[PDB]
């Protein structure tokens, strides 16, 4: 059997995470 | 080394000898000409790197005035464009049409979407503009009246199929070269054994599958026959 | 080999009249052995449930050499007007009647609809009668432009089901083979409604495979109770 | 081996007019056992079906030794007119009629479509009938100017389907072996419809071979229902 | 070493000893020929490295005065060019055209889009500079008119296929090799083991593997015949 | 140790002992002495380590005057070089030509591209330089007509192949030694291990496997004959 | 057998602490 | 079985993740 | 069966992805 | 069945791409 409704979403949700920690490492700097 | 060269290094590597074979060259070529392009965007396009002369291509163009919609009069100047359809370039290399001398002339390739917008710096108005339209055609485009008289152009550039554009090659001293198989393939030597196994691959786990090899108004896959 | 060499070499095969416990038949017999092992011959060489080939109807150049002599083409244009259909779009087309195995069938389209594509040929595909309402809809399996779906009825017929106008109907099936009749039978008797000699028109090549199955099946009628 | 050869071997292997109970065999019957070896050994040699040899029809050296002599060219240019085939570029050409198995076909094309390669050598493909409405739109594996699809009909005949014009139609083919015949047969007797007397065309490696199998297939013969 | 050695080192290791071998010795100058550039673009294309002297070869040219499109007055100044097409060259190396002399002549190996423009430096008008055109030829372009007595040149690189480079090479001091099997491979001894072993990888399962090998008008892959 | 005790050693591991084996000596020559090289590389060419004196061999050569190009007056000042090819330096140790005395003289051993432009200093006009040209010779140059009359020099390096440079030792007190297998082999002991269980390793799966064994106009490798 | 209940809310509430983890990463920074 | 729709999504957005990470470490930096 | 297609360029993807990371960690300093 | 290609330039890229972090942490 097989069904992936609860497996793509806990994959989605894993990939959404690392994704706001990429986005949250982001920083438009300034000392020039 | 040529077409014939690398379609048999797959033939042979897969012993697709006998001509009573499900894969005819014909599928060869195919996976050939799409595999070089894959590899060649997998190695030129993340960083800018130095492109082998290998990958290149010259394909020969007559050009012909057109309108530039219709013979009206107010549809705008005219633009002279290539007799037949030309191939897609890839955003790899070095794209160039020139006067049948490479050293020579100044014919500026450059996007569609650029070409709409060329020519208004005064110092630019004798610069020749070149892009393929959604036509499939090779476009010019100049504010100088002269440019209207070329009739010739030769085009190099990292083709995307390189099957057209080696059907569009300028002839060679000795001749036309007939047959596709007797001509050069566009690839690095480098880059032979990763597009041979890639393609040995593909077709490798086809050539030993199952065939609807019964003649009885049934599908017989499922069976494995 | 020609029917007086069927019979000589039935004969030679069977040990007729020599020294030893035999088998002797006559012409009418050897006849319905020769003709029953060609038409078995044929079907399991069809379905490729013969051992000995395991191969089927063109599977290889051998099948193909020994039944390429049944292959007949048929085309027609005539519908047959009142029957009932599994659809409005119906149309009805007579079998040849001496058809064994239809092998190859497609059918031309003419119709307006299709602009530009008109005399469209198209697949025609048999399918089951529980593929069928479920098929009607489909427009991957379902009829259209390129496909029509083609059911047995009764009376030797062939109902196709398409979207688009029929216009004509053509196949390519594997014919009832000539009987192997070695001599004029009586009057009364006939095999495969023939009474008069019947040549095998199938290749050479298969007739001593047919020979040695005729001999089988005549030890076979012979030695079954003993 | 000469025909004499094959008769006095053949009694020598069968202990004829020996002490020991033993069979005796005809001219008639010698050349009907004979012809049969000949027949089923080379026709099990070609599939590769003889567990002996275990090969097919060019797959060794000894193979090809042994059937190397029924090995034969043909070149037509002659298309049979009015036939019905499955496309509107369809041409018929005629089998020699002796062949038994067609090994290489090749077919030139003479066309001015193809520009400056005229005459190209084309690849005659046996296809069978299910692949072929879906061959013929096929760019890699149907009709082009390098491939040509054929397809055996009804009246020894082969349907060629190509894009271009086919201009002549080569074949290399297996052919009807001659009958091994060790007399001048009566009035009336012939083996595949000859009289009279027919040496072994193939090698003499395998004559031994064609001997022992006669010699088995006598036995059985004699030895079917005791 | 010579071909000679490295073909028979591919097919001792393989096994490939009968008349009787699906794969030929001509493959495995192809696939050596290829995973020679393959290698040596693995190597030498990261970053920059000593390049022995293994890997180079000399190629000698004839060349000859051609117009720059035709014959016409005012279609530029002519080149001098080879004679016979130029094999690609990898960017690897140190690629030198020299007059006979490799410790003397300044003759410069350029790009091809460099070439387009050379020489406008008034101290820079008397060198001769060479690149390989899209025509597959060695171009030569000099504003020093005595560039277009020059007769014959010979060209050190590493060349991107071993075997064009081979049937090109100067005469020795005994003669020419005419059997390539007689030539010398041009590769360091450190890559000849894993040039070696991936020649063989590439032919060890297709050595195994079956055929379609009874003629029987069918595909008897799928069989495993 | 020589030639022969590594040959056997090899040989032996691998059990290769009768005369009807598939793998001769041969093949163990052409693998040491490749994977000698392979090895030298792999350890002395990614920082800067110590060379055993092992490691080298002393060639030995006679020298001829040769023109530059060819006898015309203004083709240069002439070269020596030596009468036949010398081998290819690896570049990982200390190259050296001396004159029969390896404690003195100055002759210097550099590159081909270096050599082009060699002696411009006026305290350094008198130093003899060499370089391996592309013809496979060992050139000499200097501007000291006095170099013109030097007549023999022995060359001591890690020379790429061990067979070459092995053919072309200096004599020995006793005497030239005219098998290849009594001479010693050029590497330090503690890369012997390493040097022949990798060509064990290389010959230890080609040992065991199949043949095409029949004769009878077929490949047989595909059924594992 | 199965039965997701305790499965499927510990994933989730390992996806949460990840999720937390990778918010309080976030930072609106200001010196410029 | 297979199929790679869900497969290749996820893996592409795993890899687009290690992406924009290594561009946030990318610095034009200025101290000289 | 096989095929190199997604596999390949996935791979290259994930090269090219540690390729900027290692890029992104050099820095021409100045500081003496 | 094996080929190495595409398997010897991967492990050669990532070699490569190591490499390229071992030196951008060298500081003179």
């Known amino acids: 059997f097989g069904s992936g409704a609860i497996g793509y979403e806990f994959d989605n949700r894993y990939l959404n995470n690392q994704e706001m920690s990429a986005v949250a490492k982001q920083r438009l700097t300034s000392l020039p | 080394m040529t077409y014939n060269e690398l379609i048999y290094m797959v033939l042979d590597e897969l012993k697709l000898s006998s001509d009573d074979s499900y894969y005819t060259p014909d599928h060869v070529i195919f996976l050939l000409v799409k595999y070089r392009s894959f590899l060649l965007k997998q190695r030129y396009s993340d960083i800018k790197k130095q492109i082998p002369d290998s990958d290149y291509q010259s394909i020969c163009l007559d050009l012909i005035e057109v309108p530039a919609i219709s013979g009206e009069p107010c549809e705008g100047s005219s633009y002279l464009r290539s007799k037949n359809k030309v191939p897609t370039t890839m955003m790899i290399g070095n794209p160039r049409v020139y006067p049948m001398d490479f050293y020579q002339g100044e014919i500026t390739y450059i996007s569609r979407d650029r070409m709409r917008y060329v020519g208004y710096n005064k110092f630019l108005r004798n610069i020749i503009y070149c892009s393929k339209a959604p036509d499939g055609y090779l476009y010019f485009k100049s504010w100088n009246p002269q440019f209207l008289h070329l009739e010739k152009v030769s085009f190099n550039a990292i083709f995307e199929d390189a099957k057209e554009a080696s059907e569009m090659a300028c002839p060679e001293e000795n001749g036309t070269i007939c047959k596709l198989e007797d001509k050069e393939f566009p690839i690095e030597d480098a880059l032979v054994p990763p597009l041979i196994e890639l393609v040995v691959k593909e077709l490798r786990g086809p050539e030993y599958s199952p065939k609807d090899e019964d003649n009885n108004a049934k599908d017989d896959l499922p069976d494995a026959r | ?226």
């Not at chain 3, 593929?131 to 496909?147: C, E, M, Q």
């Not at chain 3, 017929?157 to 009586?186: F, G």
């Open chain 3, 1 to 226: 080999m020609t029917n007086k060499e069927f019979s000589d070499g039935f004969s030679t095969l069977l040990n007729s009249f020599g020294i030893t416990p035999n088998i002797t038949l006559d012409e009418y017999e050897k006849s319905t052995f020769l003709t029953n092992a060609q038409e078995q011959l044929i079907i399991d060489i069809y379905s490729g449930r013969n051992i000995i080939y395991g191969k089927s109807f063109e599977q290889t150049e051998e099948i193909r050499r020994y039944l390429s002599n049944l292959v007949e083409t048929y085309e027609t244009s005539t519908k047959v007007t009142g029957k009932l259909g599994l659809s409005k779009d119906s149309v009805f087309f007579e079998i040849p009647q001496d058809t064994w195995f239809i092998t190859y069938e497609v059918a031309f389209l003419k119709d307006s609809r299709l602009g530009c594509l008109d005399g469209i040929e198209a697949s025609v595909v048999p399918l089951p009668q529980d593929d069928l309402y479920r098929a009607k809809d489909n427009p991957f399996r379902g009829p259209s432009k390129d496909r029509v779906l083609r059911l047995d009825i009764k009376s030797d017929l062939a109902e196709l089901i398409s979207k688009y106008n029929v216009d004509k109907y053509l196949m390519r099936y594997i014919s009832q083979p000539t009987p192997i009749i070695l001599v004029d039978l009586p009057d009364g008797l006939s095999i495969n409604g023939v009474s008069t000699e019947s040549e095998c028109e199938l290749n050479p090549v298969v007739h001593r495979a047919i020979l040695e199955r005729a001999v089988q099946l005549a030890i076979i009628s012979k030695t079954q109770l003993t």
